[PDB]
């Protein structure tokens, strides 16, 4: 089954006519599908953008095109007066957002890459939790059986851009023997949480 | 907007400098594919996608032509203002904790990119390095700027220091971000 796409609506001019210096005129079109609880809740928002100014949008919860700034009314009026265009776009939630979610369900939403977890001294203990997907993760430090509440700092979740994430979680401790410090990592890919212990 | 998942089917970009365009699909903030608009081909970003999924690259070419038209129309009815140059924000980090002698990947994140015209290169001990370099497409942000990530596969180190070098019109001079 092929993937589908959201169509950028054509502006109605003009002719017109058409468009060296470091300047740039930028146009964006973003066809956005928002899913919650499988596909029990789906919302489509298409966004038309000049430089950084979103000037018109179609939101499936509204059901007509809407001008967002004073650059938009001519576009939104024109799109909403074209019965076939507006019908096309009202149907896109089904014909595109839901269509393509079925393909995600077979690939992307099955992707479960387990984290590599290591503990290293520091430059203080750093639990590095690397190369995982998807994003949901919980990393905790423990001293013997007690969750450390305190002296723990974490990076935000770091997106690597290659369909993996990492996170680093650091512990400040005053060691006395024979304390065992352990890093505990929970992730949806794991059959059991990963527990790594530090020595001495 | 609060959702379990968000997809961009797709992220369409056209600009007058070049001119150039970009077409890509994203899912929860990562890029599924881009379409190479001059070669007319879909380039998937994971093996699994390459094996099981299919996108007609003519779709992208159809759309981008529409953005080029739309850009003319908006310029026609407005005072035709060019993009403002943002100051991009640069971070360099590794894919995993670096040990000398063990292969790794430096990652350079260039964020708050607007307009989406940038150069990102790597330097080793001050000289240009092109083996092991690759980069993402421009990745969308919900303020309608972009980010982009460059990767350098390498064998650390003993005595090798790395810089990510970024050129953008929002900067006065090239910005060199030194790695840890």
């Amino acid at each position, epitope marked *: 089954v092929e993937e*589908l796409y959201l169509v950028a609506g054509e502006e109605g001019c003009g002719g017109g006519g058409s468009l060296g210096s470091p300047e740039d005129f930028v146009y964006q079109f973003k066809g956005m599908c928002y899913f919650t609880n499988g596909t029990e809740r789906v919302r489509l928002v298409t966004r038309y953008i000049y430089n950084r100014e979103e000037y018109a949008r179609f939101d499936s919860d509204v059901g007509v095109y809407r001008a967002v700034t004073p650059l938009g009314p001519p576009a939104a009026e024109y799109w909403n007066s074209q019965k076939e265009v507006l019908e096309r776009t009202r*149907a896109e939630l*089904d014909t595109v957002c839901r269509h393509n979610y079925q393909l995600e369900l077979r690939t992307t939403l099955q992707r479960r890459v387990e984290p590599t977890v290591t503990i290293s001294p520091s430059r203080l203990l750093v639990c590095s939790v690397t190369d995982f997907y998807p994003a949901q993760i919980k990393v905790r430090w423990f001293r013997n059986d007690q969750e450390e509440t305190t002296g723990v700092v974490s990076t935000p979740l770091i997106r690597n851009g290659d369909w993996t994430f990492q996170i680093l979680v650091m512990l400040e401790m005053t060691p006395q023997r024979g304390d065992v410090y352990t890093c505990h990592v929970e992730h949806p890919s794991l059959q059991n949480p990963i527990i790594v212990e530090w020595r001495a | 907007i609060v959702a379990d998942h968000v997809a961009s089917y797709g992220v369409n970009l056209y600009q007058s400098y070049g001119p150039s365009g970009q077409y890509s699909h994203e899912f929860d903030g990562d890029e599924e594919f881009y379409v190479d608009l001059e070669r007319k081909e879909t380039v998937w970003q994971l093996p699994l996608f390459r094996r099981f999924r299919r996108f007609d690259p003519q779709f992208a070419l159809t759309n981008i032509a529409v953005l080029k038209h739309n850009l003319n129309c908006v310029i026609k009815r407005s005072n035709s203002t060019a993009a403002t140059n943002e100051v991009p924000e640069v971070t360099v980090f590794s894919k995993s904790p670096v040990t000398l002698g063990q292969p790794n990947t430096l990652i350079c994140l260039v964020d708050n990119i607007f307009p989406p015209v940038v150069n990102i290169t790597w330097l080793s001990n001050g000289h240009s390095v092109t083996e092991g370099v690759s980069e993402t497409s421009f990745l969308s942000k919900s303020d309608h700027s972009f980010f982009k990530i460059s990767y350098l596969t390498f064998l650390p180190s003993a005595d090798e220091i790395y810089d990510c070098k970024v050129e953008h019109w929002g900067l006065d001079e090239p910005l060199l971000k030194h790695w840890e």
Partner: T-cell receptor
Amino acid sequence: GVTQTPRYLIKTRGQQVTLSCSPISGHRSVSWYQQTPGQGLQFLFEYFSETQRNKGNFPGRFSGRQFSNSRSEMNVSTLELGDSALYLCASSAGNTIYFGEGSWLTVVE
Amino acid sequence: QALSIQEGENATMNCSYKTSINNLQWYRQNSGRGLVHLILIRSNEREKHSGRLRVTLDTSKKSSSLLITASRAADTASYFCATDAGYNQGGKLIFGQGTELSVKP
């Protein structure tokens, strides 16, 4: 409706021919199709804003253009007997496409 | 393919298609003229009707049917089904081979 001219053409092998199409007003996509009993309806090319936007599988001696007002011409050079067909122009604004009446070309020996 | 029926009977035509689609549309042609659109159905619909026509769409078998009620001599024509092949815009449609319908007096 869309209008096409000329309606009827006779040519010999090796000549060239030009067909014109005026789309419905406010339609920016203009496409051309070739209809033949042997092969049915075959897509030649589509123009949008002056430029060719999609192309079918005909060789480069079939070519086209589009003017600022959206009107289109197509051209067939080094004509062959097999080029004899109904040439249809169509215009679109949305999903439905509106066809002209067609140009009938007979290439004779 | 070909269909022959009497004025006043119903005519049913069928086509199939090969790719993912957003919409399907049936067209009619008389000899030496343009195709004329009849009725459009989107891939999220099973049935749609208009005037004397009804189109059905089965997205799993990838087929469509066109029903013409109380057929007249004027319905004599070739009928073609065209899909968007997922483009959902522009002037390129993929047309099937067609059914010739003859309505007899």
